[PDB]
DNA sequence: CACAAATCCATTGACAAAAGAAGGCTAAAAGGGCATATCCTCGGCCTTTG
């Protein structure tokens, strides 16, 4: 994502700095998103949702 | 404190899609040519008319 930097880096350019061919980098993004998906870790972020 | 099964880590292959990138096609927007000559009021202004 683009937090605290002017991008928006993409998977190949990300995995360059981690030496992954973008597949493990996809997996790592997915794992972090799943971890933050948990309640008791994202109740505030839930409140930020508007609906 | 010694040996094998359980499981986070990283690549391969295949590949579906998103992103452009062009090529083509219209419709839309711009440009060009046209060849008889020339309303109503008001008021000066002058022809005619008596």
Pair A42, A34: CB distance under 8 Å: no
Tokens of A37: 């998906």
Backbone angles phi, psi at A19, to 5 degrees: 70, 15
C-alpha–C-alpha distance, residues A23 and A6, integer Å:
23
Asked if residue A15 lies in contact with residue A25, where contact means CB atoms within 8 angstroms, the answer is: yes
Point out the nucleotide closest to A31 (alpha carbon to C1′).
B8
Using the CB atom, is residue A8 less than 7 Å from strand B?
no
Resolution in angstroms comes to 3.0
Instruction: Give the helix, strand, coil percentages of chain A, each rounded to 5.
Output: 55, 0, 45
Q: How was this structure determined?
A: cryo-EM
Find the angle CA(A3)-CA(A49)-CA(A6) to the nearest 5 degrees: 15
């Amino acid at each position: 994502f683009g937090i605290d930097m002017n991008t928006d880096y993409t998977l190949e350019e990300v995995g360059k700095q981690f030496d992954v061919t973008r597949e493990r980098i996809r997996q790592i993004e997915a794992k972090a998103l799943r971890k933050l998906r948990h309640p008791s870790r994202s109740e505030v972020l839930r409140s930020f949702l508007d609906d």
